[PDB]
Amino acid sequence: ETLVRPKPLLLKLLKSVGAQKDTYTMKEVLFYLGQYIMTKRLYDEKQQHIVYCSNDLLGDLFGVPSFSVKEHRKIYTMIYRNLVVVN
Amino acid sequence: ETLVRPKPLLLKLLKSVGAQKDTYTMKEVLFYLGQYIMTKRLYDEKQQHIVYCSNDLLGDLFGVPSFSVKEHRKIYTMIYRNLVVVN
Ligand SMILES: C=C1C(=O)NCCN1C(=O)N1C(c2ccc(OC)cc2OC(C)C)=N[C@@H](c2ccc(Cl)cc2)[C@H]1c1ccc(Cl)cc1
Ligand SMILES: C=C1C(=O)NCCN1C(=O)N1C(c2ccc(OC)cc2OC(C)C)=N[C@@H](c2ccc(Cl)cc2)[C@H]1c1ccc(Cl)cc1
């Protein structure tokens, strides 16, 4: 019942998975983003809730990558990937 | 009381802000990451809790960028940056 209009880059992604409209509901945009991710297998094989933005199109939709200092898990994940134990 | 050993890339960042040890406490690594961010001004001017990973060193420490499908705010932020209203 409420339609939105994707900017060109998002429109291209939708069209890449077979959309043909110019305007979409929010549920539609979510469905097609999903489709793009599953069909290109951009999700982690082991933890499928995780999506990699290495794909240029999807990455670009995000804009400059950033994190919040409130994301403690993401920060400690980063730290521990760059540490070793002292024995 | 518990020391960890940064891998070379993290060590370089610490050394870039004046550290000289090879091993650190966790509080120390956090302090120096902080220092790097503030002194290079990688944080958003308007929302200072937000840090951009455009800086190559800091970005690389994170590895391939990813998001979780549980991050609803980050996903809708992305969607709405790529939409306009239909009038
Ligand atoms: C429902 C499913 C779903 O249950 N199965 C796969 C398709 N699928 C799906 O497309 N989605 C999922 C989602 C759930 C579990 C999951 O574990 C493996 C993986 C998911 O799928 C992505 C790995 C492809 N959750 C939705 C969602 C809806 C709204 C919001 Cl703000 C966030 C997420 C949607 C989706 C995913 C990513 C984006 Cl950018 C957009 C939509
Ligand atoms: C305390 C302060 C702090 O209060 N003031 C600035 C220095 N400062 C700081 O260095 N930090 C902050 C932090 C708080 C509010 C804030 O709003 C503007 C900005 C913050 O600072 C970054 C913008 C530079 N919170 C710590 C933290 C500690 C543990 C964890 Cl898992 C997460 C965050 C630490 C910090 C920040 C980023 C990284 Cl990668 C590592 C450490």
Swiss-Prot record, chains A, B:
Domain SWIB/MDM2: 2-85
Cellular compartments annotated: Nucleus, Nucleoplasm; Cytoplasm; Nucleus, Nucleolus; Nucleus
Sufficient to promote the mitochondrial pathway of apoptosis: region residues: 1-77
Tissue: Ubiquitous. Isoform Mdm2-A, isoform Mdm2-B, isoform Mdm2-C, isoform Mdm2-D, isoform Mdm2-E, isoform Mdm2-F and isoform Mdm2-G are observed in a range of cancers but absent in normal tissues.
Disulphide bonds in the chain: none
Annotated signal sequence range: none
Segments of this protein annotated with the region Necessary for interaction with USP2: 1-86
Post-translational modification remark: Phosphorylated at multiple sites near the RING domain by ATM upon DNA damage; this promotes its ubiquitination and degradation, preventing p53/TP53 degradation.
Induction: By DNA damage.
Annotated domain remarks: Region I is sufficient for binding p53 and inhibiting its G1 arrest and apoptosis functions. It also binds p73 and E2F1. Region II contains most of a central acidic region required for interaction with ribosomal protein L5 and a putative C4-type zinc finger. The RING finger domain which coordinates two molecules of zinc interacts specifically with RNA whether or not zinc is present and mediates the heterooligomerization with MDM4. It is also essential for its ubiquitin ligase E3 activity toward p53 and itself.
Quaternary context: Interacts with p53/TP53, TP73/p73, RBL5 and RP11. Binds specifically to RNA. Can interact with RB1, E1A-associated protein EP300 and the E2F1 transcription factor. Forms a ternary complex with p53/TP53 and WWOX. Interacts with CDKN2AIP, RFWD3, USP7, PYHIN1, and RBBP6. Interacts with ARRB1 and ARRB2. Interacts with PSMA3. Found in a trimeric complex with MDM2, MDM4 and USP2. Interacts with USP2 (via N-terminus and C-terminus). Interacts with MDM4. Part of a complex with MDM2, DAXX, RASSF1 and USP7. Part of a complex with DAXX, MDM2 and USP7. Interacts directly with DAXX and USP7.
Similarity-based family: Belongs to the MDM2/MDM4 family.
Miscellaneous information on this protein: MDM2 RING finger mutations that failed to ubiquitinate p53 in vitro did not target p53 for degradation when expressed in cells.
Disease: Seems to be amplified in certain tumors (including soft tissue sarcomas, osteosarcomas and gliomas). A higher frequency of splice variants lacking p53 binding domain sequences was found in late-stage and high-grade ovarian and bladder carcinomas. Four of the splice variants show loss of p53 binding.
Function: E3 ubiquitin-protein ligase that mediates ubiquitination of p53/TP53, leading to its degradation by the proteasome. Inhibits p53/TP53- and p73/TP73-mediated cell cycle arrest and apoptosis by binding its transcriptional activation domain. Also acts as a ubiquitin ligase E3 toward itself and ARRB1. Permits the nuclear export of p53/TP53. Promotes proteasome-dependent ubiquitin-independent degradation of retinoblastoma RB1 protein. Inhibits DAXX-mediated apoptosis by inducing its ubiquitination and degradation. Component of the TRIM28/KAP1-MDM2-p53/TP53 complex involved in stabilizing p53/TP53.
Protein name: E3 ubiquitin-protein ligase Mdm2
Organism: Homo sapiens (Human)
Residues of the full protein shown: 25 to 111 of 491
